[PDB]
């Protein structure tokens, strides 16, 4: 009962068929933890922070913006994020400024597509702020 964890942005890689114990992810339907024999699923991420615990009790947290997570029959997890950055790689002040900016533009409902785009940006910045704080 071991897990084969794969986790990579298109540009870099973080875990390559490693052996972790638990992985907590956001999934556009909730926010769940994957363990050595989780039931197979497919999900798509929302801007959040995936937390990984290795065999020894150390926690590494990476903010993912979007992507997919696959939990398979053989307990091999594949977590592909379009943009993953460690929390030390993020400006709190800049994130808060961007969040307030997007909230300010929310008034300008230029159309359904642009309204949705601004709302998505607000949600992403909200997750950024909540993770950094």
């Amino acid at each position: 009962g071991q897990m084969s964890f794969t986790f990579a942005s298109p540009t870099q890689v973080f875990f390559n068929s490693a052996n972790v114990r638990q992985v907590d992810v956001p999934t556009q339907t909730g926010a769940f933890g994957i363990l050595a024999a989780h039931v197979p699923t497919l999900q798509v991420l929302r801007p959040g922070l995936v937390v990984v615990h290795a065999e020894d009790g150390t926690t590494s947290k990476y903010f993912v913006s979007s992507g997919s997570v696959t939990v398979n029959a053989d307990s091999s997890v594949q977590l592909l994020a379009e943009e993953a950055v460690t929390l030390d790689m993020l400006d709190l002040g800049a994130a808060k400024a961007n969040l307030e900016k997007a909230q300010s533009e929310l008034l300008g409902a230029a159309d359904e597509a642009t309204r949705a785009e601004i709302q998505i940006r607000i949600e992403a910045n909200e997750a950024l702020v909540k993770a950094l704080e």
Binding site: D91, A116, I120
Partner: protein, 47 residues
């Protein structure tokens, strides 16, 4: 469904917007690395 799918988007655009948000919210030093790799250059040809 989601509040963006009902707006006629797709998950590709959603991921693009989220990645843009994150990359625009990086440290002043990592911003350079983030921007250069994520640029787009492909152009259409009408059929």
């Amino acid at each position: 469904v989601a509040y963006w799918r009902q707006a006629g988007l797709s998950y590709i655009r959603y991921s693009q917007i989220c990645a843009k948000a994150v990359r625009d919210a990086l440290k002043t030093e990592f911003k350079a690395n983030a921007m250069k790799t994520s640029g787009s250059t492909i152009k259409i040809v009408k059929v």
